[PDB]
Amino acid sequence: SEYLFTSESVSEGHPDKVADQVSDAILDAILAQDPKARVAAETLVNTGLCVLAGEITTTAQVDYIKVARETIKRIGYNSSELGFDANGCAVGVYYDQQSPDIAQGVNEGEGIDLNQGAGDQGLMFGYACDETPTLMPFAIYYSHRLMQRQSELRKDGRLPWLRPDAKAQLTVVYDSETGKVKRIDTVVLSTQHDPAISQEELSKAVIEQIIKPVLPPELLTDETKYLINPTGRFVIGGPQGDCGLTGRKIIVDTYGGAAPHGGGAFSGKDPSKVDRSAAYACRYVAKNIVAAGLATQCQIQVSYAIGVAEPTSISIDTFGTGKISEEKLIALVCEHFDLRPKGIVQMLDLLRPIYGKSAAYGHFGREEPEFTWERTDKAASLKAAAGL
Amino acid sequence: SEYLFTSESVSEGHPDKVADQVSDAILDAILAQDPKARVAAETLVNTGLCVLAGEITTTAQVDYIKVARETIKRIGYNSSELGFDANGCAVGVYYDQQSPDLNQGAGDQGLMFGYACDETPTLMPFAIYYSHRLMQRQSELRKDGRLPWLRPDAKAQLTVVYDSETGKVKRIDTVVLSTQHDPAISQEELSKAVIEQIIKPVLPPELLTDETKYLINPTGRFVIGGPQGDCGLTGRKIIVDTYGGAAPHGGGAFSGKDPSKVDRSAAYACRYVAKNIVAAGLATQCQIQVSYAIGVAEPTSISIDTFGTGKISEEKLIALVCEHFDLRPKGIVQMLDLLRPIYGKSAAYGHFGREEPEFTWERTDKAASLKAAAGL
Ligand SMILES: C[S@@+](CC[C@H](N)C(=O)[O-])C[C@H]1O[C@@H](n2cnc3c(N)ncnc32)[C@H](O)[C@@H]1O
Ligand SMILES: Nc1ncnc2c1ncn2[C@@H]1O[C@H](COP(=O)(O)O)[C@@H](O)[C@H]1O
Ligand SMILES: [Mg+2]
Ligand SMILES: [Mg+2]
Ligand SMILES: [Mg+2]
Ligand SMILES: [Mg+2]
């Protein structure tokens, strides 16, 4: 009559997320000067190490080393006690230019269709459902918020012993018949901390200040299991502790496994990379379908060929909850959304330095003004055009 | 009455796959000397560059640079004209390396998925299965000189049409294939050879129709390639490595990780569980999710979905799985004989769906016991 489902998130101090944030800070710095820049910025962080590699073609003049160090400092890695310290980190720049063989497919006036072609082949999924106020699956939505809360309390000093690296995991119970959340089964929360605080003090504060204020009280019961720093002390973390790379948190970045993923990473990529722009568009489409009341769950897949503007495929699944057929939904989507690469960029105003905030705590489910793919401004037109 | 679904794969020369293969070649070299080693070997490749970083605990003595160069050589990067070559690139070793029970706790939290279905002989989804085979065929004809103008880097993408009622594949709608090439061959000659000698020998003829669209090297040129054209990193092909989008993913990479790491061992176990449930005729579609907490042995969650195809309830299946499989981290290692150098081959053309002798998670040796224990 019920089943379990689990998602996780990590803080901005997790080493993979450090790499994502460095990649998107560099992207933002470039786009602030050159909105049309071609950016494919990959980052690897390790002990004392920040390698910047990939392909960038831009008129922007950005001090990549300074931007990387300032990003690492803003995350919290700015003191000798943490091991990994921006001031004591080697930043090495290895960027190439964008390959001209790729550029001639993407550039307008040079495509097989002379339109802006997709930056790559690939497949992308979007998803929305009615489980949370921002139309996200429950477990990833609240896992992100646990990690945001950890960072909030650290950065304003209310829990001054918190350190940057942390992880959270939620196992939730669903009703097999209704698909509705019944209760929270397990909360895992691990946080880095100053060595002077005891594990007992830490657990009390994590419960009072992080777990209880974030999760819905009605879903925490006598059966809920709390696993706080379950292997004990967590003093060293970040890239002193383990290696981080761009694009190694793609499930955290999206839907926490509540929907399939096409494989493409987001951070460090300008919007001509459909890995980013089309995944954002798919979230926008699915969210507006659910907000229009046309389905209570909606999943979309698209795909592209490098150097081709029209998607090679589109498919929509409402899991039996759609008020109209999925064929009619695809027709509505194609009428109200331009999923060609240039059409997406125009639809979502993507040639702007709006990406740094997306690189931790999830790309989806936060109704921040930067995140145009979270607007539900097409829902009314979809509902009307469906005949509802 | 119909819907579309798309998956992709990449060749062993794709820069992300180069990184995966270097990571797992180093893992194998370590495991051959020290089966109990802890390995978390990450690789980044770019123009003239192979960075090796991560954490290793072992008694093995491995020449990591030589292993990396040998792996790059085997893949086919043997000229600096390509911007990346085995003899000439810089290899830099940054590992944090140190010298150095069924209820041992997991080494991390995390979630993992497995999947199986009846669409292909090895119980894989159609689109990923044949996307892999397209890329294996590209590499085969390059290496044996049948198409000597091929270069190592390549990608393929299949869009398939499914019947909305029966769920069966009806036809192939679009084949995308991009392959790096010697500048001397025209696009017209390249396109014809890819279609006639790579694509058509691999895909089922009855699924290729006059409506099938072939998009070959659609930018018009693919001479620059490899890590120069596109930086590669370990763990950036996790959907190619698994089910091509036909099932969700927990997020963790496989390559460079020793089998104590549940990101890899539990995903392999979930494939093993799902494939045996299908092989036993208990379902035609089966998806499983597990998760772990750091320091805890038994998974924090397990769930199974047969998408209405199951012959017993999913509750009954979960009970069967707990009785017939040991999903504790050390129990998986024993179940699948994982403390051996068996991983280098997994790092290109998919971890699932090939019944190689190394791939113990592809054995259906529990199907009969599950079919009997289910009462069927
Ligand atoms: C298109 S690149 C990703 C974007 C790239 N980093 C950039 O700077 O725009 C990803 C993969 O596409 C393939 N690729 C590279 N050049 C290509 C070309 N000219 N045509 C088709 N595929 C290409 C290679 O497999 C490469 O690893
Ligand atoms: N003592 C610890 N307890 C819980 N989580 C940790 C601890 N140390 C590190 N982590 C987290 O776990 C991630 C994966 O690496 P590992 O520390 O090996 O599990 C790290 O990047 C940290 O986010
Ligand atoms: Mg990681
Ligand atoms: Mg991709
Ligand atoms: Mg890549
Ligand atoms: Mg992991």
PDB file of C-alpha atoms and ligand atoms in Angstrom, chain A residues 14 16 243 248-249, chain B residues 42, ligand 3:
ATOM      1  CA  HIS A  14      30.769  20.089  -1.384  1.00  0.00           C
ATOM      2  CA  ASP A  16      31.744  18.842  -6.822  1.00  0.00           C
ATOM      3  CA  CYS A 243      38.239  15.780  -5.563  1.00  0.00           C
ATOM      4  CA  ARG A 248      29.151  15.345 -11.141  1.00  0.00           C
ATOM      5  CA  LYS A 249      25.919  16.364  -9.365  1.00  0.00           C
TER       6      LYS A 249
ATOM      7  CA  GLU B  42      39.421  11.067 -11.314  1.00  0.00           C
TER       8      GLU B  42
HETATM    9 MG    MG C   3      31.748  13.583  -6.271  1.00  0.00          MG
END
